[PDB]
């Protein structure tokens, strides 16, 4: 079990937790703000998944300061995790190419 694979896996579990915590924290942060739409868990969760992936649909977003703070944590966690996987694939590709040359 290599480091890059363990990291990829740890990042996945971690991202899943961030999404969940984020879903809960967003509702708690947004309810109480007139016009807020990130006020129920089911869509908050869909919102966090679309924030971590940055898919950008524009159908849901935070309007309060803490929601936005929560939003940054999810964004960064998402961008970082998917980037870590990229790095884990590079380590894989570099290692087997080295083999295909002997070393």
């Amino acid at each position, epitope marked *: 079990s290599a480091l890059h694979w363990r990291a990829a896996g740890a990042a996945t579990v971690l991202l899943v937790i961030v999404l969940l915590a984020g879903s*809960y924290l967003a*509702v*708690l942060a*947004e*309810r*109480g*703000a*007139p*016009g*807020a*739409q990130l*006020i*129920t*868990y*089911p869509r908050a969760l869909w919102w966090s998944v679309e924030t971590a992936t940055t898919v950008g649909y524009g159908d849901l977003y935070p309007v309060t300061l803490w929601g936005r703070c929560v939003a940054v944590v999810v964004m960064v966690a998402g961008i970082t995790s998917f980037g870590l996987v990229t790095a884990a694939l590079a380590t894989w590709f570099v290692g087997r190419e080295q083999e295909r040359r002997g070393h």
Partner: antibody
């Protein structure tokens, strides 16, 4: 019986009463308890909400703030503090449970609050 | 906040007919509308959630439709027990808000 609310409360003008709502059954951390005001013959007016497993409360800002929400995690009871009441504050006050999904699946029988000397 | 207008305040119909209640929202809210039934001296009772999802324990006689800013609660074959006040409720934007209510009359 989801929400248990006392049948009534008599209150003198200027005085203040504290209503209770004892819940039971499936309880989650994502649960919100709501309070709704119904003046005889009229419709339903949303007062405020509380998230028990955190104690955060939100109030309807379009009306005069006469309430104060609180919760006691151990006895699974939600409380509403109505202060300095007048004839306008006389009505039935319901409490309801919301699973963070936006609709009130269950209500309390309601507590009739009367304000007179 | 979101204003929910309930068209005719009173609805008079004959036994057995199909009847429809209207709920107009001041802005687009998807399908985040819910209907409640309240009888004389009773408390509100959730009938339909998210505009059309039936609730367990509710007569199949009840159904809902719409999305955006126009919603309808329908009862196929009205009857005595259905005499009550009906209210819509939105969960799209925070303050939640309720409709003014519609009384069914046979």
């Amino acid at each position: 019986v989801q929400l248990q609310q006392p049948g009534a409360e008599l209150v003198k003008p200027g005085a203040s009463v504290k209503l209770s709502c004892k819940a039971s059954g499936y309880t989650f951390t994502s649960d919100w308890i709501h309070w709704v005001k119904q003046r005889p013959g009229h419709g339903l007016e949303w007062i405020g909400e509380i998230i028990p497993s955190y104690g955060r409360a939100n109030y309807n800002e379009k009306i005069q703030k006469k309430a104060t929400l609180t919760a006691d995690k151990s006895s699974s009871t939600a409380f509403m503090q109505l202060s300095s009441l007048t004839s306008e504050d006389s009505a039935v006050y319901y409490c309801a449970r919301e699973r963070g999904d936006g609709y009130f699946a269950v209500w309390g029988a309601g507590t009739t609050v009367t304000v007179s000397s | 906040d979101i204003l929910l207008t309930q068209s005719p305040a009173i609805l008079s119909v004959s036994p057995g007919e199909r009847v429809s209640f209207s709920c107009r929202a001041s802005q687009s809210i998807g399908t985040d509308i819910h209907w409640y039934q309240q009888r004389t001296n009773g408390s509100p009772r959730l009938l339909i959630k998210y505009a059309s999802e039936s609730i367990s324990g509710i007569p199949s006689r009840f159904s809902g439709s719409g999305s955006g800013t126009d919603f309808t609660l329908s009862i196929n074959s009205v009857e005595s027990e259905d005499i009550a006040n009906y209210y819509c409720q939105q969960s799209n934007r925070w303050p939640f808000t309720f409709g003014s209510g519609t009384k069914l009359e046979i």
